[PDB]
């Protein structure tokens, strides 16, 4: 309990960099993935349309 919450608390406090940067890579990666899928589907749909 003591040492476990101390090591996990210190490691969790030192992980804020990977959490913020990884949350930014997941954020922009998911936004670019959804926007790229919808942009590709609408792109091919408009290309076949016209």
């Amino acid at each position: 309990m003591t040492t476990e919450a101390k090591r996990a608390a210190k490691m969790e406090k030192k992980m804020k960099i990977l959490l913020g940067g990884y949350q930014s890579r997941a954020m922009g990666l998911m936004k670019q993935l959804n926007d790229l899928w919808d942009q590709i589907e609408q792109a091919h749909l408009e290309l076949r349309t016209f």
């Binding site: 040492t3 476990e4 090591r7 996990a8 210190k10 490691m11 030192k14 992980m15 960099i17 990977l18 959490l19 913020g20 940067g21 990884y22 930014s24 890579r25 922009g28 990666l29 936004k31 670019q32 926007d35 790229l36 942009q39 590709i40 792109a43 091919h44 408009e46 290309l47 016209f50």
Partner: protein
């Protein structure tokens, strides 16, 4: 106890090295977003050309 020791070792290595992978992967995701934007721009250009020909 064994899980606490293994977690202490994993936290000792992760805290002993660093990360840099959040920034590296962030740059990679930025590059992918740039490629997607380029593809969308190309598709918009082609659609614009087709619309121009149809207009003529």
């Amino acid at each position: 106890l064994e899980h606490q020791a293994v977690r202490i070792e994993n936290l000792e290595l992760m805290s002993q090295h660093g990360c840099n992978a959040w920034k590296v992967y962030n740059e990679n995701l930025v590059h992918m977003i740039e490629h997607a934007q380029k593809e969308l721009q190309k598709l918009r250009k082609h659609i614009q050309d087709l619309n121009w020909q149809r207009k003529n």
